[PDB]
Amino acid sequence: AAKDVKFGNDARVKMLRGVNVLADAVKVTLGPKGRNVVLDKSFGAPTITKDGVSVAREIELEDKFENMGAQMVKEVASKANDAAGDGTTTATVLAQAIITEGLKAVAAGMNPMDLKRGIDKAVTAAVEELKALSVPCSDSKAIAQVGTISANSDETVGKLIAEAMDKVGKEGVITVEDGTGLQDELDVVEGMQFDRGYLSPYFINKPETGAVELESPFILLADKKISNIREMLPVLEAVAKAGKPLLIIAEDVEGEALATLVVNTMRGIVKVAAVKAPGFGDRRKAMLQDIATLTGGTVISEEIGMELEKATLEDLGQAKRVVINKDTTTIIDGVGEEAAIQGRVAQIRQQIEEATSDYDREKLQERVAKLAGGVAVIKVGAATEVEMKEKKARVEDALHATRAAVEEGVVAGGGVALIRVASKLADLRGQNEDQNVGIKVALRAMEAPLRQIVLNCGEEPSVVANTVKGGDGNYGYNAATEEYGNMIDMGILDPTKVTRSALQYAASVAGLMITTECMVTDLP
Amino acid sequence: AAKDVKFGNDARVKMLRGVNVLADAVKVTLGPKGRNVVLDKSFGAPTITKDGVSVAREIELEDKFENMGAQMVKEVASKANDAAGDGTTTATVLAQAIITEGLKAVAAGMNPMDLKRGIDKAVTAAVEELKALSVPCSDSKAIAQVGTISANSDETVGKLIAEAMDKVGKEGVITVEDGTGLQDELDVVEGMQFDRGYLSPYFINKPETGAVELESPFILLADKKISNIREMLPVLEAVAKAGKPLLIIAEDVEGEALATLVVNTMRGIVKVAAVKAPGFGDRRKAMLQDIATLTGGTVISEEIGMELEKATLEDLGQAKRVVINKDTTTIIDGVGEEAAIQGRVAQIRQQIEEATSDYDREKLQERVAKLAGGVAVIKVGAATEVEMKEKKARVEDALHATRAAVEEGVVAGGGVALIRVASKLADLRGQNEDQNVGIKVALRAMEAPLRQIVLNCGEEPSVVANTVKGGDGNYGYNAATEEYGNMIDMGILDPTKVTRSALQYAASVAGLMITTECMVTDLP
Amino acid sequence: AAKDVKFGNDARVKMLRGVNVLADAVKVTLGPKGRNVVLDKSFGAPTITKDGVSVAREIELEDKFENMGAQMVKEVASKANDAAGDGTTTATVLAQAIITEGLKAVAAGMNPMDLKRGIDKAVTAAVEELKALSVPCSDSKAIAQVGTISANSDETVGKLIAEAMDKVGKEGVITVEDGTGLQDELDVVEGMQFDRGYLSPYFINKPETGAVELESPFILLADKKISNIREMLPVLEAVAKAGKPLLIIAEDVEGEALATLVVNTMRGIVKVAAVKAPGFGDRRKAMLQDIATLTGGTVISEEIGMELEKATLEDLGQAKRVVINKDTTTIIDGVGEEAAIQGRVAQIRQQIEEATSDYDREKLQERVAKLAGGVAVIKVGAATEVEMKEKKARVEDALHATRAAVEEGVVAGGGVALIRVASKLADLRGQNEDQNVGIKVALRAMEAPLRQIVLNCGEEPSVVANTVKGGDGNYGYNAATEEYGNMIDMGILDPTKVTRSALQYAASVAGLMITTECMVTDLP
């Protein structure tokens, strides 16, 4: 369509107003004294969140140009989220900051392109700086501190999380769902288990709820359904022989097998029952050897060198016992050597370091966790729904933050780290003057986080910042207690990684943004 | 789409105007001197209700922002209803209340987030408080009082309700339907009975209307239909032998079977007839063992280790007699040991405490009531339809209220309970000042219910409230009689559970709401 | 539709405003001190580029006539891209330039048609001129210089490119993809390899990730799928005898074959496995002889004078070994004489020089590179996405530019070359006066590039231009260092070919454009 082009200052200005609106709408939610924003929804009821990125996304401006600037900055808040799911708001603040200044300098008559570089360098610099301050977050305490700090100062959270991690381990999986009650709840799965119920409800062992407890069973794995393919009695009778319970897994099982199966297990002929494998072809199949191997079984390559009956009783796997309901199955413990275990695990290392990451390493580690480690889930408590949301939301950030803290350590919160590394680069210079300004600009913006925080407390951003800059190391203002001191001893930690991503992502765009000289878009 | 963001005061105000509209439109219906509201409907004729939640839902504002506010408070009114189906209006009032004050304090320049905490704490407190005053509602008298009080002071109601509960028991099921005449009517089903008529209309025993009364029959249950599968005479003749009438249940029955059956019961060979089982597959089948075991019969696992004829006359279950029409069957009594009865009941305990609640525990408790207790239904009398609606409505509120009072006890109505526990927390304080205000705010709001009721009587809300606050325990104003006294002895009872939910749900949202600093929505 | 015709000056003016808009919007991005532009997108986020042609495309004007003018000049910026993927901005500058002056001269009352010729001639001349100064770019140093200068002065780029070229050779292929990290990364494939993984995952030789390494295998090539056509064991067993591993290639393979194949390679009968050929019918088949001939194999003319088993073990090709995962296959080295190699290559010469050029000579030289040379890929580093683009973008430009400098040499950048050849034609004349102006016009415009560059540095375009014109040979202003000197010694090189296309394409349209006397289009 016919366009509307704008150059220089006009364009910039527009762009900036755009940015500001977005920014301003995200600032409000920064820090312990951060406030909330309400996002409307034709869908259901409006949403109340303090999650910066959540906000960002909803901002769209009528002014095509104002809008563009907004639509750009929006991505820092975004990328920041994909990186480590937290720090979003914070990040944004820095862009807002950088850009403002930047533009002011371009308006000053400097070459934007050098400004950019000056900034870029000043940042590359600022990063090593942080990696310096980053200190390992390893004890459960520290971890509880980041979770807590992340969840807008909710101890219960960090506390819970810390626990989970302390249990499921390092490669143990952790997820959060809506809770039934109003209290938060932590459930931890032990050993091997999955989401499959029994097809033979009649085959319930001891307890109710479909509770099956095949004492010392022989696990059996397949690659097809069993309508009338019931042929396999050898294998079957082989255990009727040993007189041990039997667990089964495969594409499925028709009543033909079940029926007879019912009365067999009934008459006391053979205590047995079966449940379907995971889910999709490559899925389920991809997950069985593990199972077998675990319990010491011999998966049936219905597709390779094997067949139905085509298999001995010793091929089966063995485990202490099992527990099944109409939706889940669990193995108490399949006697299978660690040489096998860590083995089946070791081969997961390539699966691990994958160029797929998102979705891959996900369902991946899951098994990895079930394959020796543990799986945990958290149920968030809330009276309302607009509450469960917000709540469960913050719970995840924290969940991520901790994950980031662990892999990349932490540094002093309250935006002191940055403010601190800024002083450290007070002597950083570039190829030319513009560039030096470009650097100064950035350093200057690094005070943003801190003083937005302060401002969210109705206090002098500039006065605090000062006294804070006067200090050393981790001397920092505690907005919550309204008194200075050691940010770390006070447990106000920021996972090094977020602080870093926020600065990078922020600049990465701000940088470009301030080098706009023309803008094109459609007509009103 | 292009948005419209609003920050601080502006946003808040709008939000509040929105709340108010909603609230105000729901207040009007509070208390005995509560009035009605009319909800238009393109559908048919307008609706006239005094049900707060019914109203809330209908409120939508043109001002995107005023609307958001309303869309939010609307949820308290809602949740309150999912929780215990009553107190809705009341709940709302508190929010309205909490928010008003809250905002005023934010305007005062206080940190909203502490305000929130202050409130939250003040509430957690207020709750134990109630759990304190809650006293067991067990006698039918009390139960009639909550029903009555619930149904805007209609004794006939509480009266009827009390009766029902007194009959069907504790686990007996109770439902309300539009009645035929103008008088309310209570029907109570005794023993076992469902909604299936006879396929063989010709097989009518004694009375008319298709009235069947097979004396000392043999009940038979299957899992299939019988077109030409008429093969089964062994089992048949076995009874022709015994000379007893026969009842049948299964997926269905074709004339082939019927035809022959007709003349058989006719010529006096075998007095019999049958009727289809419950409804859906997993439905009906799920409901048969129960039938069997009861009368002492052996359901036919047409699908498992069983077939047609394959079953002895002894497998059949027995009962005194039965009564069927063209739409309902009923077993006078199937001699089946209590070992079996309570057994089939005890195993319902897991079905009971189910993470399904809504829809599950319903049809569930139903059978439960039929497997020992009793079932009841109420027919509401009304000349018109616009009446039959309102009437029948309130009837349920009470039906729920009672249910709630039973399980969670009760406390003094007139919003005295709250006003009372408020005084009890006159010394509650929080971590900082803002928080103390936050608390104070909340206590202050707990006078809302009471003084709205008063206002709904054209009387000094503040004057009453005072005298009421001067009193102790359950001293309370009786809006209806316009005179003070003991709220309990007067039978003005509120099921503890509602009073509690209304406060919780109300705060839960209100709290968040007063921490709004920005709002985003689409353009006008 | 009803039209709107405009004649002479009116039309022209409109047409010009149109051009200017477009032009002006592309100028901003010229040179090291070039700035960026933002192209909005309803799609996702806005785009930030410095790529002239990228911009051009987005420009459309509301004024039907102003629009036409823009729609015209737009093609120079365009064609310039199809020609050598760079110089786009620059080209545009010249048109803008030529047109302006031209029109002014038509307004001067000259015959436009001669103006055109004068220009055309002036250009043909200027071209030989360049071809004169063009000097061979052959050393890696020079090659990195154009890369670098093309990628807005990024050495890392020219550096990287220089290397790749220095590896893959002259006919080696080079491509750029988004990298994983933030660092740019260069990967170079050695020998023969394509994008096909193993269908027999179980057939993983040594390493994980599905790593197969058939040591000294026999390669097999076919023209069909092998479900049950398993027939061919003579061929199979043939190698089972020689005890060598085996690689296969054809339409496909079904389990029937795999399954058995599995246990064979398992039992240590015959270590083998297979992977599908390239892709489409003509495709895959097109690429096999090459493979065969390479390893010294005999492709199976399943469609001609051959069949399944119909083929001896000696038909098979042989290679050191192979490397396969779930996605790619690679031959370490098929022992195949060079008489064969360069032969299968020599025949590619006709394929090469083709009238299809685009898409033809692409996938073409690919094999060519794989049939003796080497394949290379570059991964671009970027924190954001809006960065990864711009970055990766320029990277290609350079990738192109080099490609051009090599085949057509280079000349002095900073638009000196042109300004230089301009002085060389100071005595060029044509058939009549108008024509002489036509020439003069053109020469005059060749200062455009230079002084736009200067202007993008906030400096006197005319002042620099002078001092630069006062110089000789490669004396030129260095915008970046803001100081004059030898453009070549400074490594500021422009692939001769681009400079030429830019001038040509520019004039080609400009010329015509200035001979507009009427314009037709639709009504507003």
Swiss-Prot record, chains A, B, C:
One Pfam match: Cpn60_TCP1
Catalytic EC class: isomerase
EC number: 5.6.1.7
Domain of life: Bacteria
Xref: InterPro entries: Chaperonin_Cpn60_CS, Cpn60/GroEL, Cpn60/GroEL/TCP-1, GroEL-like_apical_dom_sf, GROEL-like_equatorial_sf, TCP-1-like_intermed_sf
Quaternary structure annotation from Swiss-Prot or TrEMBL: Forms a cylinder of 14 subunits composed of two heptameric rings stacked back-to-back. Interacts with the co-chaperonin GroES.
Protein name: Chaperonin GroEL
